[PDB]
RNA sequence: CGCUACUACCGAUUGGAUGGUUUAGUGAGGCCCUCGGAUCGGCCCCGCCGGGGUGCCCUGGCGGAGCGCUGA
RNA sequence: UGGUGACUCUAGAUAACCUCGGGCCGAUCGCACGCCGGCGGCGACGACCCAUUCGAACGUCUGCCCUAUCAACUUUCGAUGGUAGUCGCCGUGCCUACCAUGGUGACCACGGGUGACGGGGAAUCAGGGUUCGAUUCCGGAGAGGGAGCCUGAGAAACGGCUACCACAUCCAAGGAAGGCAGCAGGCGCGCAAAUU
RNA sequence: AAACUGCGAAUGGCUCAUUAAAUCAGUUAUGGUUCCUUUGGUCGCUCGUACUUGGAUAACUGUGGUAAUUCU
C-alpha cells in the first residue's frame, strides 16, 4: 500500500534511503532498511513492525516514543480515530462507611501503531505510559491479547 | 512561589537534626552543596547542638570564621554548609576528627575517628559516563567528579577517596556478602551483609541485608552504601555496630546500665 | 526667558536675564544643537556663536 | 500575552474550564519569525534561563547537504516552491522547517567536477568556456589519473538530479528551524523523496 | 360569611438598585515586525613648528571651517 | 568506548556551517616574598560547558461536597485524533494549514449551587459514624478590578513599571503623585477580635 | 562620606477573593525541559600595545528651571 498519503514525505528519520546506487550498488533490488527498536520490560517487537512499511512516529517499536512509567491494561471499546483507540479500565472503588465497593470506569485514549492489525472491540490491550502524544493521549499500546472466543 | 525558597521552618526541618519546637521559628536552611537538604547536617547544628562548642549561632559564626573547621580536608566558613554521609570534619585547634555516620536510630552520630583515618573517605559512585574524547568520569554521592576511574568501577560500587589528593585508591564492588550501611528509609543506619538483590526493571531494585545478629531487612538499591569488603568494614563503626535493638532490648540495656551506675 | 550661557574653554557660566523678545528672535524655531550667531544679544556678543 | 497554557482549552469531555490564575510568564508565546528570503537579518531573543534564540527574519544562504555524495556546502537560497503545511507560505515565501526550496547548485557542481570523470552533463554539453579545463583534464600523472579513473566507475547521478544541475538550481528541504536557530540549513532532495516533491509541485499547477 | 395579625403566591403596572452575559462598532497601553533618522561618533580629506617623510619639517589627541563612505 | 528494562544515549569518524542583536578559550584584585631582570607560593573575583545541590515546570494512577425543578454536552471561532509546521525552556490542538469524524455521558457527562482554597489535622464518638478545617506546617492563589510588560537564573512582581475601570491626594490649574489581604493605628462594618 | 559597580529586593510576612478533576494528597515520570547559587570536574587541548588597548560617565566644582516629587 502507498505510505505517502500526506502532503509531506513520510519516512523514518533515522534511515538514509538514497545512499548512492551504481551497477555494483544495485543487483536487482533497491533495498530499504527498517528502523525498529526493542522496547524494554520483556515486550517483544511484533513481526509486522520489523517487516512492515508504515510510517508512525508515535509507534513504540519504530517511532520516537520512550515507554517509561505505568504499564496498565484495558479493554478496547472504540476504534474510530486514526491510529488511536479508546479503551476502558474497569475497577472497584471501596466505600469505607458501608464496607463495600462500587463499579467505576475510566476511558483512556491510547495510541495504536499500524503494527497491530486485527484489533477488535473487546480485545485486551497492555499499554505503556509515554510522553504526551496529543491533548489526551499519554499511553501507547504495547501488547494485544484477543478476547476469549478466538477459533 | 516565585524563585527559590531561602528559609526553613523549625518544624519542617529534617527530624534527625533533633531540634526543639520552642527555640525559634526557623531552622538553619542548609546551603546548596554536595548533600541533599534532607540528608545533610548543617555545620551550625553540628557545632552548636551536637558538640556544644557554641551556645548561639553567632558563636558558631565566630568559630567558622576563625577558619578552624575543615570538611573533607578543606576549610569551610559557611555555617549552613551541608555536611553529610561519610564526610570528615576536622578541628585541628582541638585536634579532633569526626565522621558523619548514621546511628541505628537514623541520626548522624558524633563519631570520633583517628587522625590517620581522617585522611580518606568512602563514596558511593552514583554514575559513570564517558565524555569529551572518551575520558571516563565518575560521579559519587558527594557530587564530586573523578576522571579516569578504574574501568572495573561501576554504579552502586564504593570507592575510597584520598582527601588530600582527591584520587581513588581502592574500591568495593556491589556484590552479595559485602558489608553495607543503609542510608535511607525505615532501616536507616543499619549495617549488614548483602544477601540478595531483586532486580525490578523499570522500577526500584530491592536489596536484602542480613544483620550481624541474624536479623534481616530490605531496602531500595539507592538506600544501600557498601561500607566494607566481605563482613569487615573499611571505616570505624559507631558505638552500636549497626545492630538495631528492639525497644524491649533497649529498655533492658538501659535498666542494666542504671543498675551498674545508680 | 533667561539664558544659561557657558564658556567651556574656561569652565565658566552665567545666567543672563533677557526680557526683550527682539533679542530672542534668533533662537526661536531652531532645534537643539543648532549653531547660532550670538550677535543679536548685544554689541559685546559680536562674533560669538553658541 | 500570547499564551501556550492548556486551561483556556475545553476539557476532553467538552466541559469549560474556568481560570484559577492569571497568565504566567513561563507560559508565554512570541510572534512568529516569518523568515523571508533576503539579505541576512537575524534578531537575538533572550529566552528562559538567560539563553539566546536567534530569530532569523531574512536569510538568503544556508548550509545544505548533498547526502549521496556527502557534500555539504554553503549555498544561496533562490526560492521556496513547496510547503506541506500551508500553501500561503509559498505565496509569501516564508522559510520554515521542512519547506521545499530552490537553492543554487554551483558549489555542488564544483565539487562534482573536482571528483571528475562522470557522465557528461553541462561540463561540455551546455558550456565550453575556458579557465575550467585545467581542473577537468589538467596534466595528470599516472597515480593521479588512475585514482580519478577509479572514481570514474562509481560516479553517476540520478537523471532528476542531472536535469536539476542542468537548470542551475537544486530542490532542497530545510531541516532546521530558521525562526529558532537563525539558520536555514537542510539537505538536497534525492531518491524517492525528490520524486514525491516533484509530483506534489507539479500537482499544484 | 363578618372582625384582627404575620407570612407566601399571582404579582395591577415594571418608578427600583453593587448587577452579570452578550451581537455589532470603537479601542488605551505594552510586545513584535516593516520603516524613520533628531542627534552623536570613526575613517579618507583643505589644515596649525605641542607631527615617522632626518640638510628637523608633517604617526598618534587635537587647534585640522566638506556629508562621500561607515557605526551607534 | 561506556550505559539503560528500553535511546534517535554517551563517546567516536566524516563534509560543511558557525548569527551585525557576533560563544568560551582571564587586559581583574589582595597578602607573603629574594639574584645577572627569570622563576614561584596562598588567596579573592570572573567566564563558556558537564555533574538533578536548591528547585521550578509539565505529565501518569487513584481519590472531593449538594443538586435531575440540570439529560444529553462538545463539534461555527479546536471540539477528538492524524500529517507538516509555528511558538515555546521543552511534551502537547499550545497555536496554524490540510485531513478524518471524532471525544464525554444514568458507572451521573453538561449545567447550576457552595456562608468551598486543598491537605496535614479538629470537635464529638462503645463498635460504626457525624460535623468542621479562614487560622501559625506543606501545597495553591492574590495584592482595589482587569490587562500588558521591563529587569532578571528566577516575576506576568505590585512595599516594580505601563494603561484602562473604580476610588482618591496635592496644585499657583500648567501639572504631579497613589494602592496596609505587611507591623501598629484609623474609619466603616457589624454579635464578633488587642499597642500608632 | 558620596558615587559608579556587584548582589539581594522572586525569600519572608498577610489573606482566603477566585478555584469542583481545578487546587490538593499519596504514587510515579521527565529517555519531553530550565536551573542564580553551592560543591566537584573542565578552564596552554584551537597552528592563525600584550612589562596592559579605547571612549565615556557618575561622585566633585559650577550655572540653572518648576507651586510641587526620591523631577532633573
UniProtKB/Swiss-Prot annotation, chain A:
Q: Which residues carry this modification: Citrulline?
A: 21
Q: Which Pfam family is one of this chain's hits? A: Ribosomal_S17_N
Per the record, residues carrying N-acetylalanine are 1
Q: Which InterPro entries match?
A: NA-bd_OB-fold, Ribosomal_uS17, Ribosomal_uS17_arc/euk, Ribosomal_uS17_CS, Ribosomal_uS17_N
Residues modified as Phosphoserine: 66, 109
Specify the signal sequence span. none
Query: Which residues bear S-palmitoyl cysteine-type lipidation?
Result: 59
Q: Which domain of life is it from?
A: Eukaryota
Q: Omega-N-methylarginine modification sites?
A: 68
Give all N6-acetyllysine modified positions.
Answer: 37, 44, 57
Q: Sorted alphabetically, which keywords does the UniProt record give?
A: Acetylation, Citrullination, Cytoplasm, Lipoprotein, Methylation, Nucleus, Palmitate, Phosphoprotein, Ribonucleoprotein, Ribosomal protein, RNA-binding, rRNA-binding
Q: What subcellular locations does the record give? A: Cytoplasm; Nucleus, Nucleolus
What Gene Ontology terms for biological process does this UniProt record contain?
Answer: cytoplasmic translation; ribosomal small subunit biogenesis; translation
SUPFAM superfamilies per record? Nucleic acid-binding proteins
Q: Which family does it belong to?
A: Belongs to the universal ribosomal protein uS17 family.
Q: Give the record's subunit note.
A: Component of the small ribosomal subunit. Part of the small subunit (SSU) processome, composed of more than 70 proteins and the RNA chaperone small nucleolar RNA (snoRNA) U3.
Query: Which NCBIfam families did the record assign?
Result: PRK08572.1, uS17_arch
List the protein's name: Small ribosomal subunit protein uS17
Q: Which organism is it from?
A: Homo sapiens
The organism's taxonomy opens as: Eukaryota, Metazoa, Chordata, Craniata, Vertebrata
Curated annotation (Swiss-Prot), chain B:
Q: Can you tell which superkingdom this protein's organism belongs to?
A: Eukaryota
Pfam families found in the cross-reference section: 40S_S4_C, KOW, Ribosomal_S4e, RS4NT
Q: Which UniProt keywords apply?
A: Acetylation, Cytoplasm, Isopeptide bond, Nucleus, Ribonucleoprotein, Ribosomal protein, RNA-binding, rRNA-binding, Ubl conjugation
Checking InterPro entries in the record gives:
KOW, Rib_uL2_dom2, Ribosomal_eS4, Ribosomal_eS4_C, Ribosomal_eS4_central_region, Ribosomal_eS4_central_sf, Ribosomal_eS4_KOW, Ribosomal_eS4_N
One GO biological process term is: positive regulation of cell population proliferation
Gene Ontology CC annotations of this record: cytoplasmic ribonucleoprotein granule; cytosol; cytosolic ribosome; cytosolic small ribosomal subunit; extracellular exosome; focal adhesion; membrane; nucleolus
Which residue range or ranges hold the S4 RNA-binding domain? 41-103
Q: Supply one GO molecular-function term.
A: rRNA binding
| Sites of the Glycyl lysine isopeptide (Lys-Gly) (interchain with G-Cter in SUMO2) crosslink | 229
Where is it localised? Cytoplasm; Nucleus, Nucleolus
- For the modification N6-acetyllysine, the affected residues are 232
Job of this protein: Component of the small ribosomal subunit. The ribosome is a large ribonucleoprotein complex responsible for the synthesis of proteins in the cell. Part of the small subunit (SSU) processome, first precursor of the small eukaryotic ribosomal subunit. During the assembly of the SSU processome in the nucleolus, many ribosome biogenesis factors, an RNA chaperone and ribosomal proteins associate with the nascent pre-rRNA and work in concert to generate RNA folding, modifications, rearrangements and cleavage as well as targeted degradation of pre-ribosomal RNA by the RNA exosome.
Do you know which HAMAP family this protein is assigned to?
A: Ribosomal_eS4
Entry protein name:
Small ribosomal subunit protein eS4, X isoform
From Swiss-Prot, chain C:
Q: Which GO terms describe its cellular component?
A: cell body; cytoplasm; cytoplasmic ribonucleoprotein granule; cytosol; cytosolic ribosome; cytosolic small ribosomal subunit; dendrite; endoplasmic reticulum
**Looking at the keywords, is Lipid metabolism present?**
no
- For this entry, list what GO says about its biological process: cellular response to ethanol; cytoplasmic translation; glucose homeostasis; negative regulation of bicellular tight junction assembly; positive regulation of apoptotic process; positive regulation of cell population proliferation; response to insulin; ribosomal small subunit assembly
Q: Please tell me which positions the record assigns to the cross-link Glycyl lysine isopeptide (Lys-Gly) (interchain with G-Cter in SUMO2).
A: 14
Task: Give the residues annotated as coiled coil.
Answer: none
Would I find Ubl conjugation among this entry's keywords? yes
Sorted keywords for this record are: Acetylation, ADP-ribosylation, Cytoplasm, Hydroxylation, Isopeptide bond, Nucleus, Phosphoprotein, Ribonucleoprotein, Ribosomal protein, Ubl conjugation
Q: Tell me its family.
A: Belongs to the eukaryotic ribosomal protein eS6 family.
Q: What is this protein called?
A: Small ribosomal subunit protein eS6
User: From what organism does this protein derive?
Assistant: Homo sapiens
Parent-protein residues present: 1 to 50 of 249
Swiss-Prot record, chain D:
Record-linked Gene3D superfamilies: 3.10.290.70, Ribosomal protein S8e, subdomain (1.10.168.20)
Lipid sites, type N-myristoyl glycine:
1
Keyword Ribonucleoprotein tagged: yes
Keyword Ribosomal protein attached: yes
* GO cellular component, as recorded: cytoplasm; cytosol; cytosolic ribosome; cytosolic small ribosomal subunit; endoplasmic reticulum; extracellular exosome; focal adhesion; membrane
Any Pfam family from its record, for instance, is: Ribosomal_S8e
Functional description taken from the UniProt entry: Component of the small ribosomal subunit. The ribosome is a large ribonucleoprotein complex responsible for the synthesis of proteins in the cell. Part of the small subunit (SSU) processome, first precursor of the small eukaryotic ribosomal subunit. During the assembly of the SSU processome in the nucleolus, many ribosome biogenesis factors, an RNA chaperone and ribosomal proteins associate with the nascent pre-rRNA and work in concert to generate RNA folding, modifications, rearrangements and cleavage as well as targeted degradation of pre-ribosomal RNA by the RNA exosome.
Protein's name in the database: Small ribosomal subunit protein eS8
